[PDB]
Amino acid sequence: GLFGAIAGFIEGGWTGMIDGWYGYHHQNEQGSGYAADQKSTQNAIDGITSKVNSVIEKMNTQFTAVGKEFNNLERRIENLNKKVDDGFLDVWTYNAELLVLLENERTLDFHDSNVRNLYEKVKSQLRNNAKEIGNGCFEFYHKCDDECMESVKNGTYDYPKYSEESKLNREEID
Amino acid sequence: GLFGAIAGFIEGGWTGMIDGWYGYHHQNEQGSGYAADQKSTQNAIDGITSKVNSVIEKMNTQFTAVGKEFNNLERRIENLNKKVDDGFLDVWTYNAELLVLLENERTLDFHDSNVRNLYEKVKSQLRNNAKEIGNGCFEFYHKCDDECMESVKNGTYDYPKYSEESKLNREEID
Amino acid sequence: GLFGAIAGFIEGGWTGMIDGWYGYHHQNEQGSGYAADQKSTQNAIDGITSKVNSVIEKMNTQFTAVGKEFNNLERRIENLNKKVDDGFLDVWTYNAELLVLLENERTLDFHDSNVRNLYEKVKSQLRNNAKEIGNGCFEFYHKCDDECMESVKNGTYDYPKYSEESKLNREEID
Amino acid sequence: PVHNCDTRCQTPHGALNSSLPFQNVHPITIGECPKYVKSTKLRMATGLRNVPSI
Numbered sequence A, B, C: 001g002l003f004g005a006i007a008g009f010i011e012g013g014w015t016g017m018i019d020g021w022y023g024y025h026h027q028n029e030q031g032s033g034y035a036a037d038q039k040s041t042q043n044a045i046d047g048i049t050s051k052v053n054s055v056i057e058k059m060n061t062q063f064t065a066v067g068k069e070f071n072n073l074e075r076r077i078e079n080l081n082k083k084v085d086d087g088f089l090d091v092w093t094y095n096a097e098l099l100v101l102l103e104n105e106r107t108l109d110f111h112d113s114n115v116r117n118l119y120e121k122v123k124s125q126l127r128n129n130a131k132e133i134g135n136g137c138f139e140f141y142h143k144c145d146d147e148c149m150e151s152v153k154n155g156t157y158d159y160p161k162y163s164e165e166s167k168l169n170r171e172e173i174d
Numbered sequence D: 001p002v003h004n005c006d007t008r009c010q011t012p013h014g015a016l017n018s019s020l021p022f023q024n025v026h027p028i029t030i031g032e033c034p035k036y037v038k039s040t041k042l043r044m045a046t047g048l049r050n051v052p053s054i
């Protein structure tokens, strides 16, 4: 089913982001953002590549298939031949169309799941000092620079370095 | 998979609700509830209608299929004919039953996803002033009337109108 | 899609747990843990058993299929016979491989969903007095013994028994 | 060679005693036999990803 991220609680995509599928957008003391997340997008590329190659290699190529000939006293066999060809053609066209239609919902839900998990990870490693504000943004009670940005990105945040100082600012706003 | 809402953290359904699939139940100063959510249920109706029409239009109708006749020296061709008919019949009955069995889990998980997303939306636009209490209910520290009920329903809540007053009552209970 | 629990926010599995698929690990005043959750694992066993039996009973057994013979002036019918046999064989081998490949993602996502729901239940019945710490662990501001352990396990926690006392300890740490 | 056991399925390579739905030996069968396919492995998962701890 729909996991709720793409065109969900997160609004439309980012045109300005180029080198990936899933990324961040940061505004510390000296810049704006648009950096991609090269870890998760590589797993997505691997999954999709394996999927397409699997769908290609399940379908065998056909060899030579040439029509046959019958005279006017072999109408019965000729109708049988036509029945066999039309039956197999209907079966294969059904299989092809149905396979593509199901595979498309599978892949769109796969991307949706990736975005939701990439959001939950960032939320989980910023437990207290964040104050999420809407459509997947956070806001750092403490002060952050480029190093803590990369520290968030990699997945190594070390929360107890900042845990006291944030607390002060939180009690300032409350 | 199972998204966890229907017969999950939310208990059984509402018999008293009529005009939709997903709705609300409110108890402000002057009434009880059971109003439907006409936005999401319309998307569900559109999806299911397109699904059923797609499943109908993938199956081609058959034209005239009449049995054939053979004498006592054409047993070999007769067995071949019977083999062709039984083979195609087995293939089509397999495809029909398997298509229905997979489509049923797909549609039940689709409804389950819709209920979970409709819960997450209401939670997200009532960040501080709610105090959720169980099986998908909220409880408004501030005071609400019919206008803020519709304000929740449409998706236009304007939280900073109430954000201070709620805070007072919250500190009363703590 | 991937629900995010198995090899996600929860790390690798437990070798020391034997009698189930989903379970707990508790450290009260007088012991360590590894007790299974016999309610949810039974539903998983029922679902998987029904799935395998359904996949078995959709495939009909075949009866006797013996090759035929043709002389040197019936090459045309012989090629037709070979075409019929090879066509049906290709159709069935396609159906078998494709059915197994889709069923495998279905079952792995089913297990992943079960783990996520089993986590959300425990979180929901420990609303205030828990302080979750990472990879699916909680930590009880109040004091717990074996009886409140089973009280958590069954799904009967009665939070207002402890709600005041926990509060005291919480304000001690803050 | 010919021996004198008792089966319910027979191929020109020998007999079969199984209840699995698919079959891989030979396409010419006598009796009531599982269906012949042209594959090598149809293992089906009933369980979790085996993720050992570190």
Ligand SMILES: *[C@@H]1O[C@H](CO)[C@@H](O[C@@H]2O[C@H](CO)[C@@H](O[C@@H]3O[C@H](CO)[C@@H](O)[C@H](O)[C@@H]3O)[C@H](O)[C@H]2NC(C)=O)[C@H](O)[C@H]1NC(C)=O
Pocket: A147, A150, A151, A154, A156
């Ligand atoms: C993920 O991000 C962390 C940053 O938190 C990376 O660790 C960092 O590695 C860089 C290398 O440029 C360090 O910067 C420089 O280190 C050298 C050597 O000590 C120093 O001379 C420079 O002045 C500068 O500090 C950076 O300090 C270090 N992290 C820390 C503790 O700040 C890490 O490599 C990235 N990758 C992973 C998977 O962690």
Ligand SMILES: *[C@@H]1O[C@H](CO)[C@@H](O[C@@H]2O[C@H](CO)[C@@H](O[C@@H]3O[C@H](CO)[C@@H](O)[C@H](O)[C@@H]3O)[C@H](O)[C@H]2NC(C)=O)[C@H](O)[C@H]1NC(C)=O
Pocket: B147, B150, B151, B154, B156
């Ligand atoms: C979603 O709900 C909002 C309510 O928050 C709807 O906006 C509201 O439109 C109604 C129309 O009946 C307003 O009520 C009346 O407006 C007239 C004209 O100003 C006034 O004379 C009446 O005394 C009464 O106020 C209502 O005031 C207005 N919302 C506000 C600001 O209270 C909205 O149309 C609904 N639909 C959407 C998609 O927003």
Ligand SMILES: *[C@@H]1O[C@H](CO)[C@@H](O[C@@H]2O[C@H](CO)[C@@H](O[C@@H]3O[C@H](CO)[C@@H](O)[C@H](O)[C@@H]3O)[C@H](O)[C@H]2NC(C)=O)[C@H](O)[C@H]1NC(C)=O
Pocket: C147, C150, C151, C154, C156
């Ligand atoms: C789920 O767990 C609860 C525990 O919260 C189970 O209820 C408990 O049943 C046990 C039976 O051993 C009670 O323990 C003993 O009860 C006897 C009879 O009163 C008493 O003489 C013993 O001294 C001891 O207390 C236990 O007290 C009781 N729960 C309470 C209120 O503590 C329950 O049966 C389990 N199953 C379900 C589905 O609830």
Ligand SMILES: *[C@@H]1O[C@H](CO)[C@@H](O[C@@H]2O[C@H](CO)[C@@H](O)[C@H](O)[C@H]2NC(C)=O)[C@H](O)[C@H]1NC(C)=O
Pocket: D006, D007, D017
């Ligand atoms: C086919 O194989 C099955 C399973 O091995 C046999 O069934 C059981 O075999 C064991 C070992 O010989 C016996 O102890 C059981 O009593 C059998 N169970 C049944 C079904 O009664 C089965 O006998 C084999 N059939 C042949 C003819 O070899």
